[PDB]
Amino acid sequence: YLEGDPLTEEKIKEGLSKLVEDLGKVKKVLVVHTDYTRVDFTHLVAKNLYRFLLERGLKEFHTLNASGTHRTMKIEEFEKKLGISRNERRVFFHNHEFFNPEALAFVGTLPAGFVSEMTEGDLEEEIPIKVNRLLFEDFDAIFFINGTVPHESTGFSGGLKIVIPGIASTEVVDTFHWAAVLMGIPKLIGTVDNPARKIINRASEMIFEKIKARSFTLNMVYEEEEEVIPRALYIDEGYEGFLRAYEKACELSSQLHVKYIDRPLRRAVQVIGEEYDEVWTAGKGSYKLQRPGVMAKGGQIIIYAPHIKRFHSNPQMDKWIREIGYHCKDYVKWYLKKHPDFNKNVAAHVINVRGAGTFDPETGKEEFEFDVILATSIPEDECRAVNLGYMDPSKIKKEDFMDEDSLWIVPGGKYLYDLK
Numbered sequence: 001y002l003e004g005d006p007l008t009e010e011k012i013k014e015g016l017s018k019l020v021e022d023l024g025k026v027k028k029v030l031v032v033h034t035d036y037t038r039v040d041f042t043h044l045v046a047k048n049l050y051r052f053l054l055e056r057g058l059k060e061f062h063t064l065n066a067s068g069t070h071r072t073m074k075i076e077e078f079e080k081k082l083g084i085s086r087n088e089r090r091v092f093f094h095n096h097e098f099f100n101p102e103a104l105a106f107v108g109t110l111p112a113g114f115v116s117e118m119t120e121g122d123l124e125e126e127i128p129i130k131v132n133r134l135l136f137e138d139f140d141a142i143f144f145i146n147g148t149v150p151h152e153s154t155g156f157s158g159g160l161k162i163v164i165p166g167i168a169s170t171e172v173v174d175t176f177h178w179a180a181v182l183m184g185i186p187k188l189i190g191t192v193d194n195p196a197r198k199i200i201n202r203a204s205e206m207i208f209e210k211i212k213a214r215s216f217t218l219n220m221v222y223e224e225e226e227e228v229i230p231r232a233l234y235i236d237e238g239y240e241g242f243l244r245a246y247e248k249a250c251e252l253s254s255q256l257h258v259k260y261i262d263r264p265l266r267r268a269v270q271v272i273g274e275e276y277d278e279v280w281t282a283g284k285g286s287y288k289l290q291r292p293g294v295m296a297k298g299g300q301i302i303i304y305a306p307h308i309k310r311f312h313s314n315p316q317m318d319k320w321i322r323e324i325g326y327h328c329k330d331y332v333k334w335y336l337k338k339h340p341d342f343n344k345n346v347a348a349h350v351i352n353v354r355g356a357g358t359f360d361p362e363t364g365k366e367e368f369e370f371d372v373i374l375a376t377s378i379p380e381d382e383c384r385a386v387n388l389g390y391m392d393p394s395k396i397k398k399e400d401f402m403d404e405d406s407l408w409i410v411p412g413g414k415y416l417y418d419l420k
Contacts, residue, residue, distance in 0.1 A: 043083035066166030148249035159246030284413030328357030
């Protein structure tokens with residue numbers, strides 16, 4: 001449980017040395033980490049953890065990319081993330097295989113009653129919990145390096161979120177995403193406790209029961225200005241440890257990650273970094289501006305990301321996003337009456353991006369609280385096809401957004417905005 005401003009590599013090392021010193025046997029170790037999508041200080045944690053592990057006789061250092069539904073990473077990206085070279089023998093990177101049944105272990109089910117209660121009875125069935133089978137191999141220790149920040153689906157990220165959705169699969173992840181969207185971003189984002197967090201914790205209990213290795217949470221908190229400023233590393237053990245470290249994390253994050261403004265915005269440009277590869281993640285630009293009163297009615301959210309050219313990297317999910325397009329909650333619920341098999345994660349995503357709105361179920365017409373515009377390399381026609389706005393990314397410039405009720409947000413999609 002270390003803290004600083006900034007938190008230093010030296011302090012971090014002292015913490016990790018301490019943790020490793022208390023480990024008894026280490027030949028085989030697993031490190032579960034965030035993906036290219038998370039800009040954090042993993043590299044300071046992972047590389048030092050590995051170093052100290054070597055000194056005490058580590059034989060095998062395996063890593064697992066907590067991808068969720070995100071794309072697989074190249075070996076080079078693991079290197080960048082971990083600060084560890086591919087050319088170390090004893091080191092083995094692994095991608096997660098979210099969509100591959102054979103990669104997963106069944107640990108048990110969520111009961112229908114509880115599932116129904118989290119989802120207003122929308123689901124009403126037993127939900128199987130399946131996670132990467134690596135969790136249950138002969139490891140002496142498993143280290144989960146996670147990070148905590150306000151989040152559109154889980155109130156905050158970090159803690160057990162690295163297990164689910166990180167290294168989980170479709171059924172349980174669909175369920176929490178849908179549970180979350182029923183409450184909705186404006187109420188949910190930046191809350192410690194909420195339906196998705198309940199689902200995640202309930203399922204993780206059954207998971208940690210079956211893990212025989214000792215399990216550690218290394219829960220990071222940081223700022224991002226032009227670089228990442230580490231601020232805390234909360235290290236703890238086992239299921240209950242994950243809970244404690246997460247709660248401490250959220251208390252710090254809630255003081256550091258909320259930006260306050262005094263007037264509703266008419267224009268916000270979310271300046272998106274290379275790390276957000278596709279609309280699935282660049283949508284954070286919309287979510288972070290959805291607390292009530294933050295956007296003026298008719299306000300424009302502009303997701304400025306010239307490099308982006310897809311909605312999701314998984315072709316099927318990308319197809320699905322384009323099928324339904326971006327709409328309000330009441331339109332989507334209606335669409336699911338018509339298409340009851342439609343994927344609820346995609347369904348939740350679309351509502352999450354589009355924001356509040358009304359649906360007249362006599363006429364089918366939608367009105368929206370704000371507009372969402374894609375300033376990316378997705379063509380204008382392909383944008384309106386999915387019910388989103390468009391701006392030529394080459395015509396977007398900071399100097400056009402300094403008027404009293406506009407905002408040029410750098411870095412985009414990171415900080416939660418609130419009315420002061």
